Design a protein around this nucleic acid. Sequence first.
RNA 1: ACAU
DNA 2: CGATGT
Length: 136
Amino acid sequence: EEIIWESLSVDVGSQGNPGIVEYKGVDTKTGEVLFEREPIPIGTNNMGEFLAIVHGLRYLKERNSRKPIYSDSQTAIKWVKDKKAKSTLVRNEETALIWKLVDEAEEWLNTHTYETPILKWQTDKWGEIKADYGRK
RNA sequence: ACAU
DNA sequence: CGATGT
Ligand SMILES: [Cl-]
Ligand SMILES: [Cl-]
Ligand SMILES: [Cl-]
Ligand SMILES: [Mg+2]
Ligand SMILES: [Mg+2]
Ligand SMILES: [Rb+]
Ligand SMILES: [Rb+]
Ligand SMILES: [Rb+]
Ligand SMILES: [Rb+]
Ligand SMILES: [Rb+]
């Protein structure tokens, strides 16, 4: 219904899917970029969306912030809730980096606690999430 | 079908 | 048009 403006919004950007993956987090109210991941040579949209949420959790925990996180990814929200990224991407030498980061993100979720609400950004009602890359 |  | 996911 109502956007919670006091929040962090995250999104993935890619060149190809699977392809080059990056992600960023922004203050929902101002658009200020708060973190950006260096591009990863091969990943999927959903792996990137998952990493972006987990990085948001870690970012907010380190800063003692109780703000919620918005993501537009039904898939990534579920994977974080499950603490398990159920990606179909082949595990091979060219995908080793993304899978390392996904494995490390799951490991962090399994060893840390958080109360951060992870909320669905309602694109159909509100437009593109504020962390979007503007490539579509 | 819905979400990317 | 192709892809990733529930
Ligand atoms: Cl990461
Ligand atoms: Cl909330
Ligand atoms: Cl959801
Ligand atoms: Mg997205
Ligand atoms: Mg986007
Ligand atoms: Rb803390
Ligand atoms: Rb986009
Ligand atoms: Rb977009
Ligand atoms: Rb979207
Ligand atoms: Rb589909």
